[PDB]
Amino acid sequence: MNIIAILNHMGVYFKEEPIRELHKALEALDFQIVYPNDREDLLKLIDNNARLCGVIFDWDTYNLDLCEEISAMNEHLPVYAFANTHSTLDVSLNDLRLNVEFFEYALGAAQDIAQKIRQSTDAYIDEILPPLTKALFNYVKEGKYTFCTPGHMGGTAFQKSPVGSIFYDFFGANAMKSDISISVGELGSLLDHSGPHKEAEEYIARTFNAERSYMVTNGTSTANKIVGMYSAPAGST
Amino acid sequence: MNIIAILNHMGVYFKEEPIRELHKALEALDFQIVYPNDREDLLKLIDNNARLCGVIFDWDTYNLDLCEEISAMNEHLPVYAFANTHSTLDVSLNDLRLNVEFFEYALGAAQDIAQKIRQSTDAYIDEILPPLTKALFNYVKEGKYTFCTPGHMGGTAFQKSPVGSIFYDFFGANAMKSDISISVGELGSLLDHSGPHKEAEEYIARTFNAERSYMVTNGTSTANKIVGMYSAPAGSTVLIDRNCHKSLTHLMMMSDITPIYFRPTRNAYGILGGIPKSEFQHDTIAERVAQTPNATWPVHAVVTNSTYDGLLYNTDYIKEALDVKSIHFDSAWVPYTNFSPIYKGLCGMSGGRVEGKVIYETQSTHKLLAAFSQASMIHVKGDINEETFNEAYMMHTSTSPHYGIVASTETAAAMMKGNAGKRLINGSIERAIRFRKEIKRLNSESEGWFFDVWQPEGIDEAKCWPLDSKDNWHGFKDIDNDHMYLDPIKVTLLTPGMQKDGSMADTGIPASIVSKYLDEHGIIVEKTGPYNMLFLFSIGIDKTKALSLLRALTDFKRSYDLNLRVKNMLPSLYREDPEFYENMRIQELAQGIHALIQHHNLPDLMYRAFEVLPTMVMNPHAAFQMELRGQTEEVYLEEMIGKVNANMILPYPPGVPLVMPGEMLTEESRPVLEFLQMLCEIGAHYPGFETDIHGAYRQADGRYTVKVIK
Amino acid sequence: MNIIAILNHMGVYFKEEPIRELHKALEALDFQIVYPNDREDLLKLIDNNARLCGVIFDWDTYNLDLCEEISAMNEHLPVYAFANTHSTLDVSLNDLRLNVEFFEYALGAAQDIAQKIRQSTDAYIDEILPPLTKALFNYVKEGKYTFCTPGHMGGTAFQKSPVGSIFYDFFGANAMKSDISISVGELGSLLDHSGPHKEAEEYIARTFNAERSYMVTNGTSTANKIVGMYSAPAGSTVLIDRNCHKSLTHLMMMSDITPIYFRPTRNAYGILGGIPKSEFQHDTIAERVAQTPNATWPVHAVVTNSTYDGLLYNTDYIKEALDVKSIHFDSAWVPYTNFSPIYKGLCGMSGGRVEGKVIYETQSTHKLLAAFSQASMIHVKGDINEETFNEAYMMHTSTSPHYGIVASTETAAAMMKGNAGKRLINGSIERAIRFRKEIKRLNSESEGWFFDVWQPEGIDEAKCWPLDSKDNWHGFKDIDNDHMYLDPIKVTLLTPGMQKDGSMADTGIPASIVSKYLDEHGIIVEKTGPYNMLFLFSIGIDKTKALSLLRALTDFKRSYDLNLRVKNMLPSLYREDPEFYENMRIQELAQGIHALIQHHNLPDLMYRAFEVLPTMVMNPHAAFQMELRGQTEEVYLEEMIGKVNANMILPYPPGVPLVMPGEMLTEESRPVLEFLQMLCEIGAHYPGFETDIHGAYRQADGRYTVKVIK
Ligand SMILES: Cc1ncc(COP(=O)(O)O)c(/C=N/N[C@@H](CCCCN)C(=O)O)c1O
Ligand SMILES: Cc1ncc(COP(=O)(O)O)c(/C=N/N[C@@H](CCCCN)C(=O)O)c1O
Numbered sequence A: 001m002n003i004i005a006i007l008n009h010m011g012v013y014f015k016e017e018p019i020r021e022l023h024k025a026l027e028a029l030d031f032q033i034v035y036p037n038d039r040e041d042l043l044k045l046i047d048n049n050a051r052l053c054g055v056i057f058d059w060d061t062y063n064l065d066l067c068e069e070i071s072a073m074n075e076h077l078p079v080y081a082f083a084n085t086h087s088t089l090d091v092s093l094n095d096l097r098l099n100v101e102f103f104e105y106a107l108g109a110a111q112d113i114a115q116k117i118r119q120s121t122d123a124y125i126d127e128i129l130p131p132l133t134k135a136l137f138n139y140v141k142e143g144k145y146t147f148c149t150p151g152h153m154g155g156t157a158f159q160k161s162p163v164g165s166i167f168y169d170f171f172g173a174n175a176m177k178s179d180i181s182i183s184v185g186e187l188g189s190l191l192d193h194s195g196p197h198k199e200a201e202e203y204i205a206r207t208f209n210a211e212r213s214y215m216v217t218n219g220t221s222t223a224n225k226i227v228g229m230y231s232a233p234a235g236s237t
Numbered sequence B, C: 001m002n003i004i005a006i007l008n009h010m011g012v013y014f015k016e017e018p019i020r021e022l023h024k025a026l027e028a029l030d031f032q033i034v035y036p037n038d039r040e041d042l043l044k045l046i047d048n049n050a051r052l053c054g055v056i057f058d059w060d061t062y063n064l065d066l067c068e069e070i071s072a073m074n075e076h077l078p079v080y081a082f083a084n085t086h087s088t089l090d091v092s093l094n095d096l097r098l099n100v101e102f103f104e105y106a107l108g109a110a111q112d113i114a115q116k117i118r119q120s121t122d123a124y125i126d127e128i129l130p131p132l133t134k135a136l137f138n139y140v141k142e143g144k145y146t147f148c149t150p151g152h153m154g155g156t157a158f159q160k161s162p163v164g165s166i167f168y169d170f171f172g173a174n175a176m177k178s179d180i181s182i183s184v185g186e187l188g189s190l191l192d193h194s195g196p197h198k199e200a201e202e203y204i205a206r207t208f209n210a211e212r213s214y215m216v217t218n219g220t221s222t223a224n225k226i227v228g229m230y231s232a233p234a235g236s237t238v239l240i241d242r243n244c245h246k247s248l249t250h251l252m253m254m255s256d257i258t259p260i261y262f263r264p265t266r267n268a269y270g271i272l273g274g275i276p277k278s279e280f281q282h283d284t285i286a287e288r289v290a291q292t293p294n295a296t297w298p299v300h301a302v303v304t305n306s307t308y309d310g311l312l313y314n315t316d317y318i319k320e321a322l323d324v325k326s327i328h329f330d331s332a333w334v335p336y337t338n339f340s341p342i343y344k345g346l347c348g349m350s351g352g353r354v355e356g357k358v359i360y361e362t363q364s365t366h367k368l369l370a371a372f373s374q375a376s377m378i379h380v381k382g383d384i385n386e387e388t389f390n391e392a393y394m395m396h397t398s399t400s401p402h403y404g405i406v407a408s409t410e411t412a413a414a415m416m417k418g419n420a421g422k423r424l425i426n427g428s429i430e431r432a433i434r435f436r437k438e439i440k441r442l443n444s445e446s447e448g449w450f451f452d453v454w455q456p457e458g459i460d461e462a463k464c465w466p467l468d469s470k471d472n473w474h475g476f477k478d479i480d481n482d483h484m485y486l487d488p489i490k491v492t493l494l495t496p497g498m499q500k501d502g503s504m505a506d507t508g509i510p511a512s513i514v515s516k517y518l519d520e521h522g523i524i525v526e527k528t529g530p531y532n533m534l535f536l537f538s539i540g541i542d543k544t545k546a547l548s549l550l551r552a553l554t555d556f557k558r559s560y561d562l563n564l565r566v567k568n569m570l571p572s573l574y575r576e577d578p579e580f581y582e583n584m585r586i587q588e589l590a591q592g593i594h595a596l597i598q599h600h601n602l603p604d605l606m607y608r609a610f611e612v613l614p615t616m617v618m619n620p621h622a623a624f625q626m627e628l629r630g631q632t633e634e635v636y637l638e639e640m641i642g643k644v645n646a647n648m649i650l651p652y653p654p655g656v657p658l659v660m661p662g663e664m665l666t667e668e669s670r671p672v673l674e675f676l677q678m679l680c681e682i683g684a685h686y687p688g689f690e691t692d693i694h695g696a697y698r699q700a701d702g703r704y705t706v707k708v709i710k
């Protein structure tokens, strides 16, 4: 989630130079920059590449209807509009509903603008991730030492073995670090419907139009047996 | 200040090659070269980048009208014109008035020309810097060893310590090197008004239209105390704006002066209005004098101008009508009035000397100009003894002033000069007016509630809009005409919850909720009332911040209409009390607070409690003195009736002094108590929305006590 | 805080390769790697570089005694030990007390080890930073938009202006971003003692051995006024050290308090001594109370400890013997007394509670610790009414405090903690003692005159040296024993010109000439008397500066003995009145000034003028009030006899108040006037050596006037 599309290739130094400085500062912040040639190119780029996490364009060249077209494909995708001639009087209520952040052209402002864009990218990531998955990823980032199950202890045991190392290289570090148990209290408990798990369940029930929802980790075979045994006591038809 | 713009991209070697060599020589002299494509590009570059210290262009391609356009934005910016076909016969007198230096095209001349350009850049820097700041920077360049205060010795001590090194890295070397004392004799002394400091003072007095000016390093609170103690000896009577900052109350607790209060107005929102014209008349003052024990004709008067919410007085009428020999305008919120004609006649220093009177203006340079916190100014127009005044001045100033704060005061003055400073002030005013109009347009387009802005209908031109009796946008009853004006810089936004006639609606959104939401999304409001929010559109607000605020407001509206949960909408509020704010949505919290405000009838009680003045049994000095003697007792709120208050009671809302020390609540002043009691109740239902009453103290049992004279 | 030291060159690939990979990963995490050659090299690096935030070493090569050596310098510095042959069975409990993190050697493990090291570095930074400063830095990192004061809005306004941009570049972005107000609710409020501020206060109180502490942002002048106003109601009597800073006199002009003066001593140099023990006795105070009109038993006493020149009282005897409920030690010059055992019993906060009494210490954190100018502390030990004290505190503090000054106060406290802070204080004391001994050695091996140092004859170990009646180094007649001690930090150098018996010699070098020479050569003295110079050997003085000072002093001696010309030796003085100083040489100027001092008998007149107290006709408050009423007249110096003074007369030398407002010179106090008259005459002979008498005014014709009660 680190690709930033910069649309404009203008013909004035007072815009070109700040954009170049911003490109450098963003690349220092571990972003990959892409340069669509025109608006149709940008829209196709968005359509084909889900890792595109942001769009930079010049408000003078393109009106905010471009933001409408972008939002129709991804209403959460951050868009950064650089204002030169337009002012606060040039935005309507409908335009302000779009996820647009406004910047200005200035030499020496690339660092703070890049920091703002990094913050906005983190906000985008946070808003589209569901609660349990976000909590799991944050826990993995914390890098705690475990003396609890599972015994591989975040994949360390695999790394100590030749064949284990092959397995670890295949599945990757994150899959092993995320294999945890209820000894990690901050993630709550699936069986107890506690903490993030509870939020997850409610999230799921809202998305799937259910009053209540339960996640099952042994397939619809197990789901069927749960429903059936709750619903059909012995001796029933 | 090292950016040089080279405009031309020509087609002849005899010009191109010398310009390339000059580029190299300048870069050897530590300049950064930029290359605008055309003249409009160059003008935009100048407009947006204050570090652009010079422009190079080809006189053949561009006439000197380009220099006129450049000078209209910065008349000091050096411009270097390369002459080929034009001669001395091609320049006019008006052209020669511009800061243009002429060069020629030759191979091997780049080093000399670059040296000339370096000299001109140094001259530009020297000319725009004010004297004290220039002297301080030059001293820092000298790099002298100190065996004097401050003890950190130009930051060396910080570098010797781990945590000290973190602090030093944060603030930077120059900030520590410029922290010096009067042991450095070449900077002169603030207390003695010597050397550069003296020049600074005169500089400031010239820039701010004052006969005399004083730099203060402990804020306008200290500036007010200096002016007041010089103007009001013990046993005298002083006229005080009842909407006075607590610094004036502190002065009254210091000195045995008898106050008589100007009574300002207020509207249903709790926004303070102006003192009516009738309070400035001789007969009203005389009648109040005759009925106040140990009162004489006032020797000093203090008026808050502007109010916190941006209401300015017609000060010519006050200067003409107030029969007091000394008039002090506490102008903390309006240090910029001399730098735009829209404030003419609306500030203390406007106009000339008033016969037989001395006029003071106290200004918070740090509030609305660009200066470090605690930087303040005193401006004097009129005859003063000047030696007694210096005593009052030094008796409130530290002998070790922070030279950074002082230099920031002088630099705030320097930022106001010329075309660049005029552009600063005008740009801020126009930006504010654009934001106001946009709020009006968005409120018009909204289906359902939207934020309103406190202003008259159809603002068109940049000006201080008068408050007129026939219009009802301001909400003040029977206001005098041509008396109060709204400062466009101070933008007050209104949340729904109040009706036009002064009553409150069935639904509303208390402004504290919006302020908390804005804080969560990286936007800090100046202050919040029950249904109003104040935003300062200072010279530090640009287009980026204004558009960000608009987006934040529309985001709040959408989130509120989606009726989001407090746990998500306001994470810090939920963290305040996680049990209480579980499964509570934003609309329920807002409506609960709205209904609490409605059921207790907060606006009516707030208005009535500030309409009747509590009785003055004895001046605040005597009450404070016997508080110091331990002659006070803590009693409960329902027992203030008949008890002389020992402390100022200052409740938020409306954020202005309700009770002064030495004042007593009687039967006729019972609503005051009621209001306070109500505030207590209101604060006891929602964590994160607690009561705020200065001078009252919350007991462990949930009750409130006040200190009173035994 | 990003330097990591890697100590090894191990000769095995299975260690070297993982260390190289770790080097690369850490550099990707923005660390700077350094490579000491051996353990002694590493320890020197740690000693000389406070930005070293981590050490990596091989446990096989070096045992954990290396960690002990590191911890003795900085017990919080993270150390990372790479384990190969050692196991869990090879660590002891004492070893596990150290801040050591253990890693192992493996290919492909550089990334997670570097992440662990980054986390540990953040933990180190968090551990040593104090709470308010940490909160402020975190807020700045948040990068929020402000629509609140200060008006520059985190420095944006400066960037939009040319001169503003120069100011912004000088002070840096962080200084602007950290200039905030109480609109930022997450930082709490200084005036309300809320949030981080509260934590800061407690932190400070714990570090400085106080029950309660308060941060003051307008200097120890303001701190003194806060303490005095809380402690001395109107109509009360206060005991005042006659060697009081003029802030105490300002307080007396502000509040109607009757003073009775402790009488300190002085020596022939004009250096202030301590109050003799008999002045603290009940009988002497009672007699003075009986003789003073409108005087009662004192409720408050103020003692300067230490003096400007470094004389500390034995404060246990004062706390035991002074029968006054409140004792305030004005400790502006000694904020470091809690951080070295050599000051034990010599400061106000030393020891525990005094039964039935409250002890205050006012400290100038900016004077001798590392804090921005105007940063001051109040320390309280004893029972106080917290609410009334908070009122007195708010009465003198601005509502917009400079958060940088506040944070610097907290950071000075933090710099004083742990092994690193102890090394700071001990190193400063040792450095001062080494410099003193070197001055003695150089004076011994000088063939002719050389600078002397004001100290006992045989200083050996770091301690506050007692002043004893037998020794004559201090020059005080009949001094009490075990009463006064000399602070080694405050180094007073003596120029030739005074004999050991109190008379002056035939030849001398006035110290002003030496101070001017030192200023010309990049060295700023703290202050200068007639034949003494004061140098502060604070925690900001390093070996470089001390050696530079020694070189400058020897250069002055050589230049004086060569008898150079003033135009060359002292060019800036020559630039003052170039006509006067043409062909004038240094020895002639020095001898002329010395002979003017001798012929007028400056030491005897200075001594006698400060031995007789002028008559107190009215308290300073009454005299100042009458000056405010315009009831004073300017008369000539010769007519002072019989006239009540309206202003404090404070002459330099000796730099302490000579006449207080409300005091009157009688026949028995005629020498005072003579002294002042003398200071006028001597001041009118050499430009650049003018008279300096506060409260006197030089007229156009060259005479001096004073204001007196009409
Ligand atoms: C109708 C129905 N209800 C429940 C389940 C159990 O669900 P789980 O498999 O999650 O426990 C299945 C499973 N059916 N899957 C196929 C094989 C699929 C793999 C090859 N693509 C089968 O079993 O014939 C079902 O058809
Ligand atoms: C009318 C008036 N006169 C003097 C002063 C004192 O001026 P200083 O604060 O420079 O000493 C203030 C101060 N008012 N400022 C606010 C807090 C603002 C902080 C948040 N942006 C208040 O105290 O209510 C005043 O309003």
Ligand SMILES: Cc1ncc(COP(=O)(O)O)c(/C=N/N[C@@H](CCCCN)C(=O)O)c1O
Residues within 6 Å of the ligand: B148, B149, B150, B181, B182, B183, B398, B399, B400, C218, C219, C220, C221, C222, C224, C244, C245, C247, C304, C330, C332, C333, C364, C374, C376, C526
């Ligand atoms: C004993 C004592 N108590 C309080 C204060 C006020 O403390 P603040 O200055 O923090 O308000 C000072 C200040 N003394 N400083 C010198 C000049 C400044 C130093 C020049 N390198 C003086 O005024 O004589 C004091 O000596």
